[PDB]
mmCIF file with all atom_site columns, C-alpha atoms in Angstrom:
data_model
loop_
_atom_site.group_PDB
_atom_site.id
_atom_site.type_symbol
_atom_site.label_atom_id
_atom_site.label_alt_id
_atom_site.label_comp_id
_atom_site.label_asym_id
_atom_site.label_entity_id
_atom_site.label_seq_id
_atom_site.pdbx_PDB_ins_code
_atom_site.Cartn_x
_atom_site.Cartn_y
_atom_site.Cartn_z
_atom_site.occupancy
_atom_site.B_iso_or_equiv
_atom_site.pdbx_formal_charge
_atom_site.auth_seq_id
_atom_site.auth_comp_id
_atom_site.auth_asym_id
_atom_site.auth_atom_id
_atom_site.pdbx_PDB_model_num
ATOM 1  C CA . UNK O 1 1  ? 82.027  72.151 109.305 1.00 0.00 ? 1  UNK O CA 1
ATOM 2  C CA . UNK O 1 2  ? 84.410  74.506 110.627 1.00 0.00 ? 2  UNK O CA 1
ATOM 3  C CA . UNK O 1 3  ? 83.116  78.114 109.427 1.00 0.00 ? 3  UNK O CA 1
ATOM 4  C CA . UNK O 1 4  ? 81.186  78.144 106.378 1.00 0.00 ? 4  UNK O CA 1
ATOM 5  C CA . UNK O 1 5  ? 82.439  77.554 103.239 1.00 0.00 ? 5  UNK O CA 1
ATOM 6  C CA . UNK O 1 6  ? 82.012  77.204 99.338  1.00 0.00 ? 6  UNK O CA 1
ATOM 7  C CA . UNK O 1 7  ? 84.207  74.866 97.419  1.00 0.00 ? 7  UNK O CA 1
ATOM 8  C CA . UNK O 1 8  ? 85.295  71.968 99.264  1.00 0.00 ? 8  UNK O CA 1
ATOM 9  C CA . UNK O 1 9  ? 88.062  69.333 98.405  1.00 0.00 ? 9  UNK O CA 1
ATOM 10 C CA . UNK O 1 10 ? 85.386  66.860 98.783  1.00 0.00 ? 10 UNK O CA 1
ATOM 11 C CA . UNK O 1 11 ? 83.167  68.125 96.438  1.00 0.00 ? 11 UNK O CA 1
ATOM 12 C CA . UNK O 1 12 ? 85.941  69.426 94.055  1.00 0.00 ? 12 UNK O CA 1
ATOM 13 C CA . UNK O 1 13 ? 87.613  65.858 94.221  1.00 0.00 ? 13 UNK O CA 1
ATOM 14 C CA . UNK O 1 14 ? 84.150  64.132 93.794  1.00 0.00 ? 14 UNK O CA 1
ATOM 15 C CA . UNK O 1 15 ? 83.661  66.036 90.387  1.00 0.00 ? 15 UNK O CA 1
ATOM 16 C CA . UNK O 1 16 ? 87.107  64.598 89.383  1.00 0.00 ? 16 UNK O CA 1
ATOM 17 C CA . UNK O 1 17 ? 86.859  61.223 90.871  1.00 0.00 ? 17 UNK O CA 1
ATOM 18 C CA . UNK O 1 18 ? 89.317  61.228 93.515  1.00 0.00 ? 18 UNK O CA 1
ATOM 19 C CA . UNK O 1 19 ? 87.702  61.781 96.915  1.00 0.00 ? 19 UNK O CA 1
ATOM 20 C CA . UNK O 1 20 ? 90.163  59.410 98.473  1.00 0.00 ? 20 UNK O CA 1
ATOM 21 C CA . UNK O 1 21 ? 92.719  61.905 97.706  1.00 0.00 ? 21 UNK O CA 1
ATOM 22 C CA . UNK O 1 22 ? 91.258  63.982 100.512 1.00 0.00 ? 22 UNK O CA 1
ATOM 23 C CA . UNK O 1 23 ? 93.342  62.082 103.155 1.00 0.00 ? 23 UNK O CA 1
ATOM 24 C CA . UNK O 1 24 ? 96.388  63.488 101.768 1.00 0.00 ? 24 UNK O CA 1
ATOM 25 C CA . UNK O 1 25 ? 95.035  67.207 101.988 1.00 0.00 ? 25 UNK O CA 1
ATOM 26 C CA . UNK O 1 26 ? 93.641  66.386 105.294 1.00 0.00 ? 26 UNK O CA 1
ATOM 27 C CA . UNK O 1 27 ? 96.671  65.239 106.686 1.00 0.00 ? 27 UNK O CA 1
ATOM 28 C CA . UNK O 1 28 ? 98.110  68.561 106.016 1.00 0.00 ? 28 UNK O CA 1
ATOM 29 C CA . UNK O 1 29 ? 95.114  70.873 107.081 1.00 0.00 ? 29 UNK O CA 1
ATOM 30 C CA . UNK O 1 30 ? 93.531  71.243 103.918 1.00 0.00 ? 30 UNK O CA 1
ATOM 31 C CA . UNK O 1 31 ? 89.758  70.679 103.635 1.00 0.00 ? 31 UNK O CA 1
ATOM 32 C CA . UNK O 1 32 ? 88.496  73.421 101.161 1.00 0.00 ? 32 UNK O CA 1
ATOM 33 C CA . UNK O 1 33 ? 89.652  73.710 97.411  1.00 0.00 ? 33 UNK O CA 1
ATOM 34 C CA . UNK O 1 34 ? 90.364  77.493 98.033  1.00 0.00 ? 34 UNK O CA 1
ATOM 35 C CA . UNK O 1 35 ? 92.816  76.483 100.801 1.00 0.00 ? 35 UNK O CA 1
ATOM 36 C CA . UNK O 1 36 ? 94.767  74.993 97.457  1.00 0.00 ? 36 UNK O CA 1
ATOM 37 C CA . UNK O 1 37 ? 93.208  77.618 95.020  1.00 0.00 ? 37 UNK O CA 1
ATOM 38 C CA . UNK O 1 38 ? 97.256  78.511 94.448  1.00 0.00 ? 38 UNK O CA 1
ATOM 39 C CA . UNK O 1 39 ? 98.714  75.269 94.977  1.00 0.00 ? 39 UNK O CA 1
ATOM 40 C CA . UNK O 1 40 ? 101.472 74.075 93.049  1.00 0.00 ? 40 UNK O CA 1
ATOM 41 C CA . UNK O 1 41 ? 102.522 70.579 91.755  1.00 0.00 ? 41 UNK O CA 1
ATOM 42 C CA . UNK O 1 42 ? 105.090 70.446 94.674  1.00 0.00 ? 42 UNK O CA 1
ATOM 43 C CA . UNK O 1 43 ? 102.625 71.532 97.696  1.00 0.00 ? 43 UNK O CA 1
ATOM 44 C CA . UNK O 1 44 ? 100.414 68.772 96.246  1.00 0.00 ? 44 UNK O CA 1
ATOM 45 C CA . UNK O 1 45 ? 103.315 66.422 96.144  1.00 0.00 ? 45 UNK O CA 1
ATOM 46 C CA . UNK O 1 46 ? 104.142 67.655 99.550  1.00 0.00 ? 46 UNK O CA 1
ATOM 47 C CA . UNK O 1 47 ? 100.725 66.644 101.176 1.00 0.00 ? 47 UNK O CA 1
ATOM 48 C CA . UNK O 1 48 ? 101.794 63.242 99.543  1.00 0.00 ? 48 UNK O CA 1
ATOM 49 C CA . UNK O 1 49 ? 99.295  63.217 96.721  1.00 0.00 ? 49 UNK O CA 1
ATOM 50 C CA . UNK O 1 50 ? 100.665 60.955 93.768  1.00 0.00 ? 50 UNK O CA 1
ATOM 51 C CA . UNK O 1 51 ? 101.832 62.186 90.242  1.00 0.00 ? 51 UNK O CA 1
ATOM 52 C CA . UNK O 1 52 ? 98.739  60.622 88.785  1.00 0.00 ? 52 UNK O CA 1
ATOM 53 C CA . UNK O 1 53 ? 96.485  62.520 91.235  1.00 0.00 ? 53 UNK O CA 1
ATOM 54 C CA . UNK O 1 54 ? 98.427  65.593 91.895  1.00 0.00 ? 54 UNK O CA 1
ATOM 55 C CA . UNK O 1 55 ? 98.319  66.362 87.909  1.00 0.00 ? 55 UNK O CA 1
ATOM 56 C CA . UNK O 1 56 ? 94.392  66.081 87.813  1.00 0.00 ? 56 UNK O CA 1
ATOM 57 C CA . UNK O 1 57 ? 94.012  67.693 90.979  1.00 0.00 ? 57 UNK O CA 1
ATOM 58 C CA . UNK O 1 58 ? 96.330  70.543 90.305  1.00 0.00 ? 58 UNK O CA 1
ATOM 59 C CA . UNK O 1 59 ? 94.587  70.823 86.918  1.00 0.00 ? 59 UNK O CA 1
ATOM 60 C CA . UNK O 1 60 ? 91.361  71.416 88.836  1.00 0.00 ? 60 UNK O CA 1
ATOM 61 C CA . UNK O 1 61 ? 92.709  74.259 90.951  1.00 0.00 ? 61 UNK O CA 1
ATOM 62 C CA . UNK O 1 62 ? 94.195  76.179 87.871  1.00 0.00 ? 62 UNK O CA 1
ATOM 63 C CA . UNK O 1 63 ? 90.998  76.059 86.166  1.00 0.00 ? 63 UNK O CA 1
ATOM 64 C CA . UNK O 1 64 ? 89.702  77.751 89.131  1.00 0.00 ? 64 UNK O CA 1
ATOM 65 C CA . UNK O 1 65 ? 92.078  80.394 89.342  1.00 0.00 ? 65 UNK O CA 1
ATOM 66 C CA . UNK O 1 66 ? 91.543  81.304 85.728  1.00 0.00 ? 66 UNK O CA 1
ATOM 67 C CA . UNK O 1 67 ? 87.849  82.408 86.276  1.00 0.00 ? 67 UNK O CA 1
ATOM 68 C CA . UNK O 1 68 ? 89.651  85.118 88.680  1.00 0.00 ? 68 UNK O CA 1
ATOM 69 C CA . UNK O 1 69 ? 92.361  85.852 86.347  1.00 0.00 ? 69 UNK O CA 1
ATOM 70 C CA . UNK O 1 70 ? 91.949  85.502 82.657  1.00 0.00 ? 70 UNK O CA 1
ATOM 71 C CA . UNK O 1 71 ? 94.464  85.255 80.016  1.00 0.00 ? 71 UNK O CA 1
ATOM 72 C CA . UNK O 1 72 ? 95.031  86.656 76.298  1.00 0.00 ? 72 UNK O CA 1
ATOM 73 C CA . UNK O 1 73 ? 97.818  87.577 74.012  1.00 0.00 ? 73 UNK O CA 1
ATOM 74 C CA . UNK O 1 74 ? 97.829  91.234 73.215  1.00 0.00 ? 74 UNK O CA 1
ATOM 75 C CA . UNK O 1 75 ? 95.138  92.987 75.372  1.00 0.00 ? 75 UNK O CA 1
ATOM 76 C CA . UNK O 1 76 ? 95.953  94.031 78.951  1.00 0.00 ? 76 UNK O CA 1
ATOM 77 C CA . UNK O 1 77 ? 99.580  95.528 79.796  1.00 0.00 ? 77 UNK O CA 1
ATOM 78 C CA . UNK O 1 78 ? 101.041 95.883 83.320  1.00 0.00 ? 78 UNK O CA 1
ATOM 79 C CA . UNK O 1 79 ? 103.915 97.627 85.206  1.00 0.00 ? 79 UNK O CA 1
ATOM 80 C CA . UNK O 1 80 ? 106.822 95.187 85.711  1.00 0.00 ? 80 UNK O CA 1
ATOM 81 C CA . UNK O 1 81 ? 109.500 95.471 88.336  1.00 0.00 ? 81 UNK O CA 1
ATOM 82 C CA . UNK O 1 82 ? 112.746 94.313 86.944  1.00 0.00 ? 82 UNK O CA 1
#
């Protein structure tokens, strides 16, 4: 519902076994996983998601972010700004 989407908090949470947590996401306006693809433990906690769930959920979101940006020691450089 509401425009086409890919990964939803419903399926995203279902895979982790915490679909009930959706109420906390919807209560703030989050229905898609992408909407929180870059969510922090703070934001997740702000929505009212418990620490026992925010961690699991947060973990799932992080794993999704790694797909877009991988990490490796001594491989690629970057141009830092102070």
